From Swiss-Prot, chain A:
Assembly and oligomerization: Interacts (via N-terminus) with the capsid assembly scaffolding protein (via C-terminus); capsid proteins and scaffolding proteins form building blocks that assemble to form the procapsid. Interacts with the portal protein.
Family the entry assigns: Belongs to the P22 phage major capsid protein family.
Written domain comment of the UniProt record: The insertion domain (I domain) plays an important role in the folding of the capsid protein by acting as an intramolecular chaperone.
Protein location: Virion
Protein name as annotated: Major capsid protein
Residues of the site described as Involved in capsid stabilization and maturation: 7
Source organism: Salmonella phage P22 (Bacteriophage P22)
The protein's role, per its UniProt record: Self-assembles to form an icosahedral capsid with a T=7 symmetry.
Curated annotation (Swiss-Prot), chain B:
Gene Ontology terms, MF aspect: hydrolase activity
UniProt signal peptide: none
One Gene Ontology cellular component: virus tail
The UniProt record lists the keyword Signal: no
Organism: Salmonella phage P22 (Bacteriophage P22)
Keywords: Degradation of host cell envelope components during virus entry, Degradation of host peptidoglycans during virus entry, Hydrolase, Late protein, Lyase, Viral genome ejection through host cell envelope, Viral penetration into host cytoplasm, Viral short tail ejection system, Virion, Virus entry into host cell
Main function: Tail protein that binds the portal ring and functions as a head completion protein. 12 copies of gp4 form a structural ring at the bottom of the portal ring. Together with gp10 and gp26, gp4 is required for stabilization of the condensed DNA within the capsid; perhaps by plugging the hole through which the DNA enters. Plays a role in ejection of the bacteriophage DNA into the host cell at the initiation of infection. Functions as an exolysin that catalyzes the cleavage of the glycosidic bonds between N-acetylmuramic acid and N-acetylglucosamine residues in peptidoglycans.
GO biological process, one term: symbiont entry into host cell via disruption of host cell envelope
Protein's recorded name: Head-to-tail adapter protein gp4
Lineage of source species: Viruses, Duplodnaviria, Heunggongvirae, Uroviricota, Caudoviricetes
Localisation per UniProt entry: Virion
Keyword Coiled coil recorded: no
Length: 54, 152
């Protein structure tokens, strides 16, 4: 708030002001990955991959 | 091996037949050599069915090189006898001849020997069916929930 000093304040009344800020969002962060059907290396480790993704 | 070119294979085939060489005074004629080189190329291109047939290391002539004769055949040491015996058999009908029984037998033996190692390599077993359990003895499979084999 502003503040004046004096006795007579004719035509010195101020107004009100209230600024603001904005918060937004960007883009998702993904871990898109694939699982080949016939793969031992894909059958194993597809849970360690989830942990590493987390 | 002293047999290192398509012309060398053709000379061996003609000598086997009895059309060239020094056992008789007859000499190799260029028109009878070009035809035999054509027949050899056709025979090996038929045997090597785009890689799904008999593998021998033969190197196929390119249209750029003027004489197909003169090039190395590219075979191994153990393919030469089979190749030129079968060539003699193939080119015998041109001279109204007939390859002798010994040449026919050697050609059969050589072709079979040529395909033997390829047959051994191609004798392979398929993987387990996709509808087949891994069993509870396979501890790693029971761990990462690999209850069934992949298949294909």
């Amino acid at each position: 708030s502003p503040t004046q000093e004096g006795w007579d304040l004719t035509d010195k009344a101020t107004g009100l002001l209230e600024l603001n800020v904005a918060v937004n969002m960007g883009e998702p962060d993904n871990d898109f990955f694939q699982l080949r059907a016939d793969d031992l290396r894909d059958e194993t480790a597809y849970r360690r991959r989830i942990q590493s993704a987390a | 091996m002293q047999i290192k070119t398509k012309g060398d294979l053709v000379r061996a085939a003609l000598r086997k037949l009895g059309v060239a060489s020094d056992a008789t005074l007859t000499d190799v004629e260029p028109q009878s050599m070009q035809d035999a080189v054509d027949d050899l190329e056709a025979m090996m291109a038929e045997w090597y069915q785009d890689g799904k047939g008999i593998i021998t290391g033969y190197v196929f002539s390119d249209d750029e090189n003027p004489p197909a004769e003169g090039d190395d055949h590219g075979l191994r040491s153990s393919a030469v006898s089979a190749v030129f015996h079968n060539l003699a058999c193939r080119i015998a009908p041109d001279y109204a001849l007939e390859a002798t029984a010994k040449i026919i037998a050697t050609a059969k033996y050589g072709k079979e020997l040529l395909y033997k190692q390829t047959a051994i390599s191609r004798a392979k077993r398929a993987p387990y069916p996709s509808r087949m359990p891994t069993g509870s003895g396979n501890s790693f499979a029971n761990l990462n929930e690999w209850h069934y084999f992949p298949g294909e």
